[PDB]
Short mmCIF file of C-alpha atoms in Angstrom, two decimals:
data_model
loop_
_atom_site.label_atom_id
_atom_site.label_comp_id
_atom_site.label_asym_id
_atom_site.label_seq_id
_atom_site.Cartn_x
_atom_site.Cartn_y
_atom_site.Cartn_z
CA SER X 1 -5.35 8.56 45.32
CA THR X 2 -6.63 10.89 42.52
CA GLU X 3 -6.45 14.07 44.52
CA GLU X 4 -2.23 13.38 43.73
CA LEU X 5 -2.80 13.83 40.43
CA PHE X 6 -5.90 16.59 40.33
CA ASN X 7 -3.19 18.62 42.32
CA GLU X 8 -1.87 20.11 39.14
CA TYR X 9 -5.25 21.86 38.17
CA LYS X 10 -5.48 23.25 41.61
CA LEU X 11 -2.77 25.67 40.68
CA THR X 12 -4.81 26.81 37.29
CA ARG X 13 -7.60 28.83 36.65
CA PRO X 14 -10.49 28.64 33.45
CA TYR X 15 -10.41 31.53 31.34
CA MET X 16 -12.66 32.91 28.38
CA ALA X 17 -11.15 33.08 25.07
CA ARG X 18 -12.61 33.78 21.41
CA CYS X 19 -15.23 31.66 19.71
CA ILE X 20 -15.72 32.65 15.84
CA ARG X 21 -19.11 30.84 15.80
CA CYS X 22 -21.17 31.30 19.18
CA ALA X 23 -25.09 31.15 20.16
CA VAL X 24 -25.69 34.05 17.97
CA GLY X 25 -22.24 35.91 16.48
CA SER X 26 -18.64 35.62 17.41
CA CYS X 27 -18.38 36.10 20.91
CA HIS X 28 -15.92 35.71 23.77
CA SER X 29 -16.39 32.38 25.47
CA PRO X 30 -15.99 30.33 28.47
CA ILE X 31 -15.99 27.28 26.54
CA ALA X 32 -13.87 27.81 23.84
CA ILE X 33 -12.37 24.73 22.11
CA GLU X 34 -8.62 25.01 21.78
CA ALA X 35 -8.24 21.30 20.09
CA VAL X 36 -9.83 17.93 19.09
CA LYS X 37 -7.82 15.21 18.70
CA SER X 38 -9.22 12.07 17.59
CA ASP X 39 -6.71 9.40 16.96
CA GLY X 40 -8.06 6.58 18.52
CA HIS X 41 -10.06 4.02 16.93
CA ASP X 42 -13.94 3.00 17.81
CA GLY X 43 -15.09 6.89 18.40
CA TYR X 44 -13.34 8.47 21.05
CA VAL X 45 -12.12 12.12 20.90
CA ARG X 46 -10.02 14.07 22.99
CA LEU X 47 -11.26 18.00 23.47
CA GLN X 48 -8.88 20.46 24.97
CA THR X 49 -11.43 23.06 26.27
CA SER X 50 -11.07 26.50 27.83
CA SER X 51 -12.74 25.29 30.95
CA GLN X 52 -12.07 22.93 33.67
CA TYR X 53 -13.50 19.65 34.65
CA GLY X 54 -13.64 17.63 37.81
CA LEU X 55 -12.97 20.64 40.22
CA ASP X 56 -15.28 23.10 42.16
CA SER X 57 -15.08 26.95 41.93
CA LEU X 61 -12.36 17.91 44.08
CA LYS X 62 -16.06 17.04 42.74
CA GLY X 63 -16.81 14.07 40.50
CA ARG X 64 -18.69 15.48 37.40
CA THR X 65 -18.49 19.56 37.15
CA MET X 66 -17.08 21.98 34.83
CA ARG X 67 -15.51 24.97 36.34
CA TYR X 68 -15.48 28.20 33.86
CA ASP X 69 -14.80 31.47 33.97
CA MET X 70 -17.14 34.02 33.58
CA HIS X 71 -16.04 37.81 32.85
CA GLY X 72 -13.90 36.74 36.30
CA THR X 73 -15.86 35.19 38.15
CA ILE X 74 -15.41 31.39 38.22
CA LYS X 75 -18.59 29.32 38.33
CA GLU X 76 -19.74 25.78 37.87
CA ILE X 77 -22.16 23.48 36.42
CA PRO X 78 -22.71 19.94 36.69
CA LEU X 79 -21.37 17.87 33.63
CA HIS X 80 -24.46 16.38 32.38
CA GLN X 81 -25.93 19.76 31.62
CA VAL X 82 -22.95 20.22 28.82
CA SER X 83 -23.99 18.38 25.84
CA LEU X 84 -21.93 18.29 22.47
CA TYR X 85 -22.59 17.12 19.02
CA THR X 86 -20.80 16.60 15.87
CA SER X 87 -23.47 15.54 13.40
CA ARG X 88 -25.18 13.07 16.16
CA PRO X 89 -25.42 13.66 19.27
CA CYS X 90 -21.92 12.67 21.47
CA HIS X 91 -21.86 11.27 24.42
CA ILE X 92 -19.21 12.66 27.51
CA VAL X 93 -17.33 10.10 29.76
CA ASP X 94 -15.17 12.50 31.85
CA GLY X 95 -12.86 15.43 32.06
CA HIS X 96 -9.79 16.09 34.08
CA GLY X 97 -8.24 19.93 33.80
CA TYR X 98 -8.57 21.42 30.38
CA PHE X 99 -9.52 17.99 28.65
CA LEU X 100 -12.57 15.96 28.32
CA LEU X 101 -13.09 12.56 26.58
CA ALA X 102 -16.38 12.36 24.29
CA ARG X 103 -17.49 9.25 22.27
CA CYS X 104 -18.16 11.23 19.14
CA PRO X 105 -19.23 9.83 15.80
CA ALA X 106 -17.73 11.57 12.56
CA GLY X 107 -18.15 14.86 11.21
CA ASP X 108 -16.90 18.52 10.35
CA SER X 109 -17.15 20.19 13.50
CA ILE X 110 -17.37 20.12 17.25
CA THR X 111 -19.90 21.98 18.92
CA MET X 112 -20.03 22.41 22.88
CA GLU X 113 -23.32 24.26 24.53
CA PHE X 114 -24.87 24.49 28.09
CA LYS X 115 -27.57 26.38 29.83
CA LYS X 116 -27.83 28.74 32.24
CA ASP X 117 -31.14 30.19 33.37
CA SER X 118 -31.78 31.96 30.11
CA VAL X 119 -28.57 32.10 28.44
CA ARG X 120 -27.57 29.51 26.11
CA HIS X 121 -23.67 29.45 25.81
CA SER X 122 -22.07 27.33 22.43
CA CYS X 123 -18.92 27.45 20.62
CA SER X 124 -18.48 25.73 17.22
CA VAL X 125 -14.92 25.60 15.43
CA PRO X 126 -14.42 23.81 12.13
CA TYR X 127 -12.27 20.96 13.44
CA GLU X 128 -12.31 17.60 11.51
CA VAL X 129 -13.85 14.97 13.83
CA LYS X 130 -12.90 11.11 12.39
CA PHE X 131 -13.88 8.02 12.97
CA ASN X 132 -11.12 5.12 12.35
CA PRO X 133 -12.58 1.71 12.52
CA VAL X 134 -9.98 -1.33 13.23
CA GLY X 135 -9.06 -4.19 10.75
CA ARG X 136 -10.12 -4.88 7.25
CA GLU X 137 -14.30 -4.72 7.75
CA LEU X 138 -15.16 -1.08 7.56
CA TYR X 139 -17.90 -0.24 9.85
CA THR X 140 -19.56 2.95 11.28
CA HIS X 141 -20.54 1.85 14.71
CA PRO X 142 -18.82 -1.31 16.46
CA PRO X 143 -20.55 -4.35 15.94
CA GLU X 144 -22.26 -6.38 18.80
CA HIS X 145 -19.81 -9.53 18.57
CA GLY X 146 -17.07 -10.82 16.31
CA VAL X 147 -13.25 -11.29 17.42
CA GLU X 148 -11.00 -9.03 19.36
CA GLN X 149 -8.05 -7.04 17.85
CA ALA X 150 -5.15 -4.91 19.11
CA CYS X 151 -6.41 -1.34 18.99
CA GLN X 152 -5.24 1.93 20.26
CA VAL X 153 -7.69 4.08 22.12
CA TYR X 154 -7.71 7.02 24.64
CA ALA X 155 -7.27 5.97 28.10
CA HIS X 156 -10.36 6.70 30.59
CA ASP X 157 -8.26 7.85 33.35
CA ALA X 158 -5.93 10.42 34.21
CA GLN X 159 -2.69 9.31 35.16
CA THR L 4 20.68 13.04 43.35
CA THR L 5 18.79 16.08 42.16
CA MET L 6 18.78 19.50 43.44
CA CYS L 7 15.94 22.06 42.71
CA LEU L 8 16.04 25.82 43.39
CA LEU L 9 14.29 28.63 44.83
CA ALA L 10 17.34 30.74 45.52
CA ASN L 11 20.90 29.83 46.31
CA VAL L 12 19.68 26.77 48.08
CA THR L 13 20.27 23.21 46.69
CA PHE L 14 17.64 21.49 48.53
CA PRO L 15 16.11 18.19 48.05
CA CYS L 16 13.24 18.41 45.16
CA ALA L 17 11.37 15.64 47.41
CA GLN L 18 11.69 18.14 50.45
CA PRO L 19 10.06 21.07 49.93
CA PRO L 20 9.53 24.12 52.44
CA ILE L 21 6.35 25.27 51.56
CA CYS L 22 3.10 24.52 50.29
CA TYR L 23 0.38 25.94 48.13
CA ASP L 24 -2.30 26.10 50.65
CA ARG L 25 0.18 28.72 52.92
CA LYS L 26 1.83 30.46 49.63
CA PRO L 27 -0.16 31.71 46.87
CA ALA L 28 2.84 32.24 44.30
CA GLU L 29 6.28 30.82 45.96
CA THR L 30 5.39 27.61 45.03
CA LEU L 31 4.64 28.95 41.48
CA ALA L 32 7.93 30.93 41.73
CA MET L 33 9.49 27.61 43.00
CA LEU L 34 8.20 25.74 39.93
CA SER L 35 9.23 28.77 37.89
CA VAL L 36 13.09 28.19 37.45
CA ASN L 37 12.58 24.36 38.23
CA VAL L 38 11.08 23.48 34.39
CA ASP L 39 14.19 22.37 33.29
CA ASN L 40 14.57 19.81 35.81
CA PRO L 41 14.38 15.71 35.65
CA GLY L 42 12.73 16.10 39.02
CA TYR L 43 9.72 18.23 38.31
CA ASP L 44 7.16 15.33 38.96
CA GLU L 45 8.99 14.59 42.07
CA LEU L 46 8.95 18.13 42.94
CA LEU L 47 5.71 18.76 42.01
CA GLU L 48 4.01 15.74 43.78
CA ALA L 49 6.23 16.41 46.89
CA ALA L 50 5.24 20.27 46.83
CA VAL L 51 1.94 20.20 46.58
CA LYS L 52 0.58 18.18 49.82
CA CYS L 53 2.01 18.55 53.23
CA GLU O 345 25.30 63.59 -16.09
CA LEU O 346 29.00 64.10 -17.23
CA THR O 347 31.79 65.68 -15.28
CA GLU O 348 35.07 66.86 -16.81
CA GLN O 349 37.51 63.54 -16.79
CA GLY O 350 35.05 61.56 -15.26
CA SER O 351 33.56 57.96 -16.28
CA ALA O 352 30.14 57.26 -16.57
CA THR O 353 28.67 54.00 -15.90
CA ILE O 354 25.34 52.83 -17.35
CA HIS O 355 22.82 49.83 -17.56
CA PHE O 356 21.68 47.78 -20.47
CA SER O 357 19.97 44.86 -21.21
CA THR O 358 20.28 42.36 -24.33
CA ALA O 359 19.35 39.21 -25.51
CA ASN O 360 22.79 38.65 -27.38
CA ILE O 361 25.63 35.99 -26.17
CA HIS O 362 28.35 38.55 -28.22
CA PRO O 363 27.02 41.73 -27.99
CA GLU O 364 28.53 44.66 -29.83
CA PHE O 365 26.97 47.91 -30.83
CA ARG O 366 27.31 51.85 -31.53
CA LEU O 367 26.38 53.73 -28.21
CA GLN O 368 25.59 57.05 -29.02
CA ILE O 369 26.85 59.83 -26.35
CA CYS O 370 25.47 63.55 -27.19
CA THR O 371 27.31 63.34 -30.56
CA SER O 372 29.54 60.63 -30.81
CA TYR O 373 29.49 56.73 -31.11
CA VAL O 374 31.76 54.58 -29.26
CA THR O 375 31.49 50.80 -29.35
CA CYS O 376 30.71 48.63 -26.94
CA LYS O 377 31.81 45.27 -27.22
CA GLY O 378 31.97 42.15 -24.82
CA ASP O 379 30.87 38.14 -24.20
CA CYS O 380 27.61 38.05 -22.18
CA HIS O 381 26.72 34.65 -19.94
CA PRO O 382 23.90 32.80 -19.22
CA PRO O 383 21.91 34.37 -15.80
CA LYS O 384 21.19 31.73 -12.91
CA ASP O 385 16.97 31.76 -13.18
CA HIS O 386 15.45 29.80 -14.91
CA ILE O 387 11.80 31.51 -14.46
CA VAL O 388 11.60 34.90 -13.23
CA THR O 389 8.36 37.52 -12.00
CA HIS O 390 8.83 40.11 -14.22
CA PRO O 391 8.59 40.65 -18.25
CA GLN O 392 11.08 40.87 -20.60
CA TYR O 393 13.03 44.15 -21.07
CA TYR Y 1 23.83 24.85 -8.69
CA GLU Y 2 24.74 21.24 -8.73
CA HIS Y 3 28.63 20.83 -7.99
CA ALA Y 4 30.50 17.59 -7.76
CA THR Y 5 34.18 17.20 -6.78
CA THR Y 6 36.33 14.65 -4.81
CA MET Y 7 38.24 15.04 -1.79
CA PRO Y 8 41.21 12.42 -0.88
CA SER Y 9 40.60 10.54 2.35
CA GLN Y 10 43.09 12.12 4.64
CA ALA Y 11 42.45 13.42 7.97
CA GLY Y 12 44.12 17.26 9.34
CA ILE Y 13 44.89 18.47 5.52
CA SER Y 14 42.62 21.14 4.27
CA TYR Y 15 41.02 20.81 1.08
CA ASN Y 16 40.11 23.84 -0.88
CA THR Y 17 38.40 24.70 -4.29
CA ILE Y 18 35.97 26.99 -5.90
CA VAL Y 19 33.04 26.98 -8.13
CA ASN Y 20 32.95 29.24 -11.05
CA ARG Y 21 29.93 30.31 -12.30
CA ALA Y 22 29.84 31.36 -15.83
CA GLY Y 23 28.73 35.00 -15.45
CA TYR Y 24 29.19 35.48 -11.67
CA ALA Y 25 31.89 35.89 -8.56
CA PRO Y 26 33.82 32.64 -7.86
CA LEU Y 27 32.43 31.51 -4.75
CA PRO Y 28 35.20 29.40 -2.64
CA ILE Y 29 34.66 26.02 -0.82
CA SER Y 30 37.02 25.07 1.86
CA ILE Y 31 36.63 21.22 3.57
CA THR Y 32 39.24 20.30 6.44
CA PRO Y 33 38.46 16.57 7.43
CA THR Y 34 39.40 16.03 11.26
CA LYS Y 35 38.50 12.58 12.36
CA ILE Y 36 37.32 9.69 9.96
CA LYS Y 37 36.30 7.00 11.88
CA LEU Y 38 34.92 3.41 10.42
CA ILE Y 39 32.64 1.29 12.98
CA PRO Y 40 31.48 -2.68 12.12
CA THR Y 41 28.06 -4.20 12.59
CA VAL Y 42 29.55 -5.80 15.58
CA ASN Y 43 27.86 -8.90 17.18
CA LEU Y 44 28.70 -10.80 20.53
CA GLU Y 45 28.77 -14.07 20.60
CA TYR Y 46 30.55 -15.54 23.72
CA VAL Y 47 33.21 -13.91 26.65
CA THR Y 48 35.68 -16.24 28.07
CA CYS Y 49 37.97 -15.84 31.08
CA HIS Y 50 40.14 -18.23 33.88
CA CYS P 266 -16.79 37.39 4.77
CA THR P 267 -13.88 35.61 5.95
CA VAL P 268 -12.41 33.20 3.91
CA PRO P 269 -9.92 30.50 4.35
CA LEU P 270 -6.83 30.19 2.64
CA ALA P 271 -4.87 27.37 1.37
CA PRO P 272 -1.07 26.21 1.79
CA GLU P 273 1.68 28.03 -0.14
CA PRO P 274 2.49 25.67 -3.10
CA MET P 275 6.31 24.70 -3.36
CA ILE P 276 7.43 25.77 -6.89
CA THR P 277 10.02 24.07 -8.33
CA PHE P 278 11.69 25.65 -11.42
CA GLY P 279 13.12 24.15 -14.56
CA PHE P 280 13.89 25.10 -18.03
CA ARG P 281 10.75 26.47 -19.38
CA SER P 282 8.85 24.62 -16.85
CA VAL P 283 6.96 25.42 -13.38
CA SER P 284 6.16 22.12 -11.09
CA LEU P 285 3.80 22.51 -8.08
CA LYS P 286 3.64 20.69 -5.09
CA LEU P 287 -0.10 21.16 -3.90
CA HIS P 288 -1.38 20.20 -0.13
CA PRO P 289 -4.92 21.34 0.15
CA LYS P 290 -6.84 21.34 3.39
CA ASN P 291 -10.39 22.01 1.72
CA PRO P 292 -11.21 21.55 -2.07
CA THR P 293 -9.62 24.43 -3.95
CA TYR P 294 -9.58 25.60 -7.56
CA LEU P 295 -6.43 25.77 -9.38
CA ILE P 296 -6.83 28.29 -12.36
CA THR P 297 -4.17 28.71 -14.67
CA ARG P 298 -3.74 30.48 -18.23
CA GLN P 299 -0.86 31.48 -20.22
CA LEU P 300 -0.31 35.20 -21.46
CA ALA P 301 -0.42 34.68 -25.22
CA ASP P 302 -3.00 34.64 -27.68
CA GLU P 303 -3.89 31.07 -26.80
CA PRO P 304 -4.35 31.36 -22.99
CA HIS P 305 -5.15 27.75 -22.88
CA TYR P 306 -6.60 27.85 -19.26
CA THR P 307 -7.15 24.95 -16.81
CA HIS P 308 -9.93 24.84 -14.40
CA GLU P 309 -9.35 22.35 -12.03
CA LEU P 310 -10.48 21.42 -8.73
CA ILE P 311 -7.83 19.76 -6.31
CA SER P 312 -8.82 18.01 -3.07
CA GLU P 313 -6.07 15.93 -2.31
CA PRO P 314 -2.18 16.16 -2.56
CA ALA P 315 -1.08 16.27 -6.35
CA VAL P 316 1.71 17.34 -8.09
CA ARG P 317 0.99 19.56 -11.24
CA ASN P 318 3.87 20.02 -13.68
CA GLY J 198 3.04 16.93 3.41
CA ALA J 199 4.25 13.94 2.87
CA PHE J 200 6.41 11.17 5.30
CA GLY J 201 8.75 12.43 7.81
CA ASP J 202 7.76 15.79 7.50
CA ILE J 203 8.48 15.48 11.51
CA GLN J 204 12.05 13.39 11.93
CA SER J 205 13.02 12.77 15.63
CA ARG J 206 16.15 10.47 15.67
CA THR J 207 14.86 8.52 18.91
CA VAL J 208 11.68 8.32 20.71
CA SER J 209 12.75 10.60 23.46
CA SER J 210 15.58 12.70 21.58
CA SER J 211 14.38 15.89 22.32
CA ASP J 212 15.66 17.26 19.02
CA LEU J 213 13.51 17.19 16.23
CA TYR J 214 13.61 18.14 12.23
CA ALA J 215 10.52 19.80 11.36
CA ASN J 216 9.86 21.30 7.48
CA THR J 217 6.39 21.54 7.56
CA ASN J 218 5.78 24.66 5.79
CA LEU J 219 4.57 26.81 8.29
CA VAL J 220 3.50 30.34 7.21
CA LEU J 221 2.06 33.20 9.63
CA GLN J 222 -0.65 34.91 8.55
CA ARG J 223 -2.35 38.69 9.82
CA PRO J 224 -4.94 38.53 12.44
CA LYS J 225 -8.53 39.86 12.20
CA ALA J 226 -9.17 43.50 13.41
CA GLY J 227 -10.37 43.31 16.73
CA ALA J 228 -9.37 39.56 17.94
CA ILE J 229 -6.37 38.28 19.52
CA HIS J 230 -5.59 35.26 18.20
CA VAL J 231 -2.09 33.47 16.09
CA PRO J 232 -3.59 32.95 12.48
CA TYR J 233 -1.24 30.49 10.87
CA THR J 234 -0.93 28.41 7.44
CA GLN J 235 0.77 25.19 6.84
CA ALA J 236 0.72 21.88 4.64
CA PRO J 237 -1.08 18.92 6.48
CA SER J 238 0.24 16.54 8.60
CA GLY J 239 2.17 13.97 6.41
CA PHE J 240 1.73 10.65 8.84
CA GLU J 241 -1.67 11.20 8.40
CA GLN J 242 -1.62 11.12 4.73
CA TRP J 243 0.68 8.38 4.74
CA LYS J 244 -1.29 6.25 6.49
CA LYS J 245 -4.13 6.96 3.67
CA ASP J 246 -1.91 5.90 1.24
CA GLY N 54 -41.98 39.94 17.98
CA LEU N 55 -45.56 41.42 19.31
CA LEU N 61 -43.92 45.16 21.25
CA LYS N 62 -42.50 42.59 22.98
CA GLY N 63 -38.31 41.48 22.82
CA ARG N 64 -37.66 37.73 21.63
CA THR N 65 -41.24 36.01 21.37
CA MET N 66 -43.28 33.89 18.99
CA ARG N 67 -46.82 34.64 18.73
CA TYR N 68 -49.14 32.13 17.22
CA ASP N 69 -53.16 31.17 16.89
CA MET N 70 -54.35 28.49 18.24
CA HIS N 71 -57.99 27.39 17.13
CA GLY N 72 -58.20 30.85 17.57
CA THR N 73 -56.88 32.21 20.82
CA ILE N 74 -53.76 33.82 20.05
CA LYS N 75 -51.07 32.56 22.53
CA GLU N 76 -47.05 33.41 22.91
CA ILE N 77 -44.02 31.63 24.19
CA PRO N 78 -40.89 32.94 24.36
CA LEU N 79 -38.24 32.37 21.48
CA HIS N 80 -35.83 30.56 23.36
CA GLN N 81 -38.22 27.57 23.57
CA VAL N 82 -38.53 26.89 19.97
CA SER N 83 -35.99 24.97 18.37
CA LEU N 84 -35.21 24.45 14.68
CA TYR N 85 -32.70 21.89 12.85
CA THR N 86 -32.14 21.21 8.99
CA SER N 87 -29.69 18.50 10.06
CA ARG N 88 -27.57 19.59 12.67
CA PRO N 89 -29.34 22.10 14.73
CA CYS N 90 -29.44 25.28 13.86
CA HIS N 91 -29.64 29.05 15.67
CA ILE N 92 -32.25 31.26 15.52
CA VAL N 93 -30.85 35.23 15.30
CA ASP N 94 -33.78 37.17 15.25
CA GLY N 95 -37.75 37.28 14.52
CA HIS N 96 -40.06 40.19 12.91
CA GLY N 97 -43.22 39.54 11.62
CA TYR N 98 -43.98 36.37 9.56
CA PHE N 99 -40.21 36.03 9.12
CA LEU N 100 -37.52 34.19 10.91
CA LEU N 101 -33.54 34.85 10.49
CA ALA N 102 -31.94 31.52 11.50
CA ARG N 103 -28.22 30.19 10.98
CA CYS N 104 -28.34 26.57 9.31
CA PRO N 105 -26.37 24.25 7.89
CA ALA N 106 -26.96 22.54 4.65
CA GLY N 107 -30.10 19.54 4.70
CA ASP N 108 -32.83 18.53 2.50
CA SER N 109 -35.54 19.25 4.95
CA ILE N 110 -36.29 21.98 7.71
CA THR N 111 -37.99 21.20 11.07
CA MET N 112 -39.52 23.87 13.50
CA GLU N 113 -40.87 22.30 16.60
CA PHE N 114 -42.01 24.17 20.14
CA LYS N 115 -43.07 22.32 23.03
CA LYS N 116 -45.75 23.47 25.00
CA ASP N 117 -46.60 21.61 28.83
CA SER N 118 -46.86 18.32 27.50
CA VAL N 119 -48.14 19.00 23.95
CA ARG N 120 -44.96 18.70 21.23
CA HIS N 121 -46.07 20.59 17.72
CA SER N 122 -43.63 20.41 14.71
CA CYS N 123 -43.68 20.95 11.15
CA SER N 124 -41.16 19.64 8.38
CA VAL N 125 -41.59 20.80 4.99
CA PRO N 126 -39.36 19.05 2.11
CA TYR N 127 -37.73 22.47 1.27
CA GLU N 128 -33.86 22.08 -0.02
CA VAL N 129 -31.62 24.34 2.69
CA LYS N 130 -28.15 24.87 1.47
CA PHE N 131 -24.71 26.20 2.39
CA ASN N 132 -22.97 28.71 -0.02
CA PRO N 133 -19.16 28.92 0.37
CA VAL N 134 -17.21 32.43 -1.05
CA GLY N 135 -14.76 32.13 -3.20
CA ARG N 136 -12.30 29.43 -4.31
CA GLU N 137 -12.05 27.32 -1.77
CA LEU N 138 -15.29 25.10 -0.69
CA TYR N 139 -15.65 24.90 3.06
CA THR N 140 -18.45 23.64 4.96
CA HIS N 141 -17.82 25.55 8.04
CA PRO N 142 -16.49 28.96 8.05
CA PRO N 143 -12.87 29.40 9.01
CA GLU N 144 -11.44 30.98 12.04
CA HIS N 145 -9.22 33.28 10.03
CA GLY N 146 -8.36 34.12 6.26
CA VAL N 147 -8.33 36.95 3.91
CA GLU N 148 -11.27 39.37 4.22
CA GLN N 149 -13.59 38.72 1.29
CA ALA N 150 -16.71 40.53 -0.23
CA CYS N 151 -20.23 38.14 0.22
CA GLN N 152 -24.07 39.09 0.23
CA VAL N 153 -25.70 37.82 3.36
CA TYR N 154 -28.89 38.17 4.87
CA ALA N 155 -28.75 41.77 6.94
CA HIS N 156 -30.03 41.42 10.36
CA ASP N 157 -31.88 44.17 10.65
CA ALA N 158 -35.36 44.52 9.71
CA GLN N 159 -35.11 47.89 7.58
#
């Protein structure tokens, strides 16, 4: 049962907050980025955003954001983000998201409505951490296995 | 055991009187005073569903 | 300001470890003698007086 | 202001002192030891009985 | 324009000496000079945690 | 900014020692946020050393 | 701007055409953000990089232009940020004006 784990975020709502670097200027944004934690090894970050994920206004791959009071939604494959290269979103649960990002010095989440393009950039360093004693930047095809620490792919 | 609080009523934390689809803000008021509680997880997981 | 029989308190600044100076007060000279001590701070945030 | 002193290892009795900075007011310091334990590093080997 | 603001240095005093623990977030110029006829200025770019006596 | 700026006695001790040089700043005109400045994490800097 | 609000106007083998301005993307290294346009000129917001590429897309024909011109980023003051911060002390600067005055 996953609904017994999603039951906490039924109690809450998305909200709008301040993003100092929006699509034009400094706006009040539905996708304000509270934090970026990147302490796992092979490229996994964990955003804490102002939106919510996995809930409709349970649905599988959606983002539930706030829009001037009125709570709206899009599918999660409309949202993209990037640091220096494009990232790849895995999944979301409540105020959080799990991407597979390369290294850079900022996060820019963005999605697009019929004509209004929403964005949020925050100057938070995203770092990439290799395992062991051979410094790569993209993990290899093969080799040996080592004990690493990555962010878990399931809410629990 | 551990007895949670909604009033001056020490009820078992796994046995809620109400649900969230019934009351909009009384489950919230029950989770208000019960933050400092070693059975908050039991209270919440039993208190959302029927 | 002087009263008739009171006692006037002044503040001064020095570098002397045994200061002794004649204090002129309006006609007359009084001798002030004492022993100064090192202060508590090494580096301060105002220039020297 | 680094001040070093020495206290006898005896409970109950108050130990008093002051600190005289050479041009300031004397600062009194009082230490009264209450309970002074001594806990060895203890390593169980075996138990026995009847 | 809004510019950032570095962390507060941790100043330790000694007899005719000032030490400075400097933890920068992003690279930051430390510019010192003496208030005498010879200023002996020091324009340095510090990017890492560094102690300057 | 060094090792042990955060000191919790055990892993679940619920009492931690924090000396992180946290300073609050003044917010921007027309913005609701809490600005702050502090020395960066010393466990990460210890992992870098 | 030719009046019409947010549009690009371009010559296409003689016949002058137009598209909206949210259909035009450009990037130095990261993607940029167009603010406004007025005549031959455009005001973007780009990060630093050693080239600049502008491209729009027709129904199935993609158009692009890349020129090797250094686009550079300039901090203000004695801290060398790469992205401007979320807070800090106010300081004087010299930026491009948004209006077409």
